[PDB]
Symmetry: C3
Subunit: 258 residues, 3 copies
Amino acid sequence: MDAQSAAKCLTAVRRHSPLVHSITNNVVTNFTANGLLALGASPVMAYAKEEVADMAKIAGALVLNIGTLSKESVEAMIIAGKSANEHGVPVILDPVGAGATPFRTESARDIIREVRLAAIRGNAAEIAHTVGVTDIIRLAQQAAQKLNTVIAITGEVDVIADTSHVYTLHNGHKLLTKVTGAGSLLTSVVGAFCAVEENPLFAAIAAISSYGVAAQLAAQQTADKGPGSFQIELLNKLSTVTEQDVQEWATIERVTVS
Amino acid sequence: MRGSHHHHHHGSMDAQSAAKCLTAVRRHSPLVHSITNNVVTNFTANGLLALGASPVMAYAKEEVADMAKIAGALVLNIGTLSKESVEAMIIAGKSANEHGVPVILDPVGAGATPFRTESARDIIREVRLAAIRGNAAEIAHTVGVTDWLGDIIRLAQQAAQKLNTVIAITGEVDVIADTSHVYTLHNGHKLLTKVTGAGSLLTSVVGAFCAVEENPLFAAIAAISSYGVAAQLAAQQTADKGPGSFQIELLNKLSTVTEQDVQEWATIERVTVS
Amino acid sequence: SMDAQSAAKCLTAVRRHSPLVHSITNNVVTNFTANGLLALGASPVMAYAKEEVADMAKIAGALVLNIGTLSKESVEAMIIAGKSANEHGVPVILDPVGAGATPFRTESARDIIREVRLAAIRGNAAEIAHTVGVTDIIRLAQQAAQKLNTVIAITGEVDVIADTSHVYTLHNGHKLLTKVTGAGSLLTSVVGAFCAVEENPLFAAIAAISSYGVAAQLAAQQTADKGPGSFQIELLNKLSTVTEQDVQEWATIERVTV
Ligand SMILES: Nc1ncnc2c1ncn2[C@@H]1O[C@H](COP(=O)(O)OP(=O)(O)OP(=O)(O)O)[C@@H](O)[C@H]1O
Ligand SMILES: Nc1ncnc2c1ncn2[C@@H]1O[C@H](COP(=O)(O)OP(=O)(O)OP(=O)(O)O)[C@@H](O)[C@H]1O
Ligand SMILES: Nc1ncnc2c1ncn2[C@@H]1O[C@H](COP(=O)(O)OP(=O)(O)OP(=O)(O)O)[C@@H](O)[C@H]1O
Ligand SMILES: Cc1ncsc1CCOP(=O)(O)O
Ligand SMILES: Cc1ncsc1CCOP(=O)(O)O
Ligand SMILES: Cc1ncsc1CCOP(=O)(O)O
Ligand SMILES: [Mg+2]
Ligand SMILES: [Mg+2]
Ligand SMILES: [Mg+2]
Ligand SMILES: [Mg+2]
Ligand SMILES: [Mg+2]
Ligand SMILES: [Mg+2]
């Protein structure tokens, strides 16, 4: 899996314009929909228990985010997840805040036990707190082997590992940490890619790589204006990034282990 | 504040009359109360403020009735609807109708799921609507059909005739109609398809105009045209930059577009019918 | 007692400690608030569920309650979280958005005051007056701070801030903030940010509002005649860009004799 494969997956997301159903936090709804529209995908947000199962089945991908979770909303995520698995719709989870409060940790787990997930995307602390029922390259694998899915731990360096493989990504910019939704949007981007790419691990890597190179390009363009401009430039790049920009910038390293 | 800026007795709703309505909106700065989806809250409010109106969001049943009666226009949006929201939307719709406040509906997603479809229909049965804005499919599921897939008149006008309201089906070409009149607008830019809320914001702008224009057909036409021109103006400064810059520019133009810009750029076409 | 040089000193403190500001606010300003705080140098977090508000607040640096789009459930949650804050010495800030415009907002605002010890209350003259009751702006702020034994920050053209025995007048910011939704909500949260590192609440409010106002000014010059949209973005950049220096320079703080 390299730069060439990634770039090609980006073109397929644009060619099919995957409908991504997100049940996420109200701090990133607008950013997320705008990011997906820019990428070339079709976003849709639905949270009511009277329709999440109906919306998930006609979708290309379902993404769950607990950022500002509620009891009834968590209830809806699982309902939607079950409807999704029943129809072959890839499900991606973003364990926002897992470990911060007991409720988020419980909820993350709850969803993982009730929904066949295609991938989980979060920071190291969140993956660890979620998976740490008792007593990050090695963290990814163990988590991916245990939960049996694609574990994507993003940060200065991205660590994506699946049942038997491990990859590290080297793109993006530190400015991404100053924009709320950077992760929520990314997680949703991952869903858009899993919708057109049969291999989850490959979808994650491509989605994250495309996202990163887009962020670098926005970064240089943003010069030193600030967080506001960068945010705006990211939405622009997700649209202007080309299959080529990915090919010559994407840094994908297949980790050799045991 | 709701007067009339054009009458068919003077001819077809035109470009100058629409320019008139824009100044009127900015003169009175109507308080536009919208019970909308949480994907477009911030953008809606910023767009309305840029235009010159007064945005306000209130969803609680404990207050919607009160907020609606002192509003210039009420706008209902089911983008991320819930049972509570719909009940609220109807509570407020009724109170708005009871106080003569024009109510605008944006059937976001009608058709995608039967829940959105039923809710949109529940609102229409319970609330008198001044206008309804949405795309071709949403409009079709809201009013009736079966075999989805002649909108530039037929659908728009027949929809208006059944629900006795104003039907505005936006798109590359816009079809606005009431029980016996229909128009087509040719303003805007393709980049509005890349901004979330572009339509929810527009339905809101429709509310503001309805608050200053007695005739909803006219208010709707003036609203969409001013919105489209601003869009056009916005795309020019930022077409090579991307959706992000466009989004921001659109907000900039909604405040700097003048009635001059609207009178000279607006392209409104009266459709011969019946 | 408090001046520009000290104000700027606080801005540095915020960025140094990057306090966790817990906001239970309206869904019209959530994305703007988190981005604004991030650019400033604070760490925002939003949590509304009663199954976690007490837990999130006790681990925060400051709690802010904004009733912009209030519901019965969120108001009860704001109180539950308020009390938890009180018990852990976490400053609480209240933004009575719309108080006086609707009876429910008025009562929800008063109910919160009755149950939660607050460090400050930020809002426009009308909201403060309808909330606290009737006894210019300087007299109003002073009487209010005295009755509720808290800090009253009535922003606007000229900012009037006062605790039970002191009153200050601020003269920064720019008119365009009037055209950006959430300008007040982000400010309140900014206030919470300053309260998280400045022991005296009155000094905190002043420092927060001055910094915010200077940033607003700078963004407006760079914005000029472009529009509300470009301003909103520039404001985000400036909350990141503005320096201790800029505050010491532009900050215009004035103590009133009464
Ligand atoms: N310091 C950094 N330098 C370069 N790229 C980064 C950095 N931090 C994150 N990224 C990248 O930013 C994107 C943002 O995802 P990120 O892991 O920050 O989200 P998150 O869910 O908000 O987490 P966190 O709470 O830790 O901010 C990814 O493409 C990631 O590789
Ligand atoms: N292809 C286009 N070319 C020019 N203007 C357009 C185009 N599509 C929409 N507009 C304009 O954009 C505005 C946006 O309304 P639109 O019909 O896209 O909203 P919507 O509710 O988001 O629908 P949709 O889901 O189909 O994106 C109107 O002013 C309309 O005339
Ligand atoms: N006319 C003005 N000129 C300059 N600065 C202003 C003006 N009005 C407000 N500000 C500043 O704007 C910031 C915004 O707070 P503001 O009082 O407008 O918020 P609000 O909660 O939205 O209230 P309101 O509903 O009355 O608009 C503060 O820094 C304040 O000093
Ligand atoms: C600030 C904040 N508080 C609760 S969710 C949230 C946003 C989630 O953001 P991100 O995708 O960056 O993790
Ligand atoms: C992405 C999304 N999901 C539910 S509502 C919504 C926004 C509605 O947007 P628009 O006004 O463009 O039709
Ligand atoms: C338009 C609107 N409607 C309900 S809350 C809200 C935003 C409140 O904003 P601000 O902090 O500027 O007062
Ligand atoms: Mg982050
Ligand atoms: Mg995250
Ligand atoms: Mg659209
Ligand atoms: Mg729409
Ligand atoms: Mg306010
Ligand atoms: Mg304001």
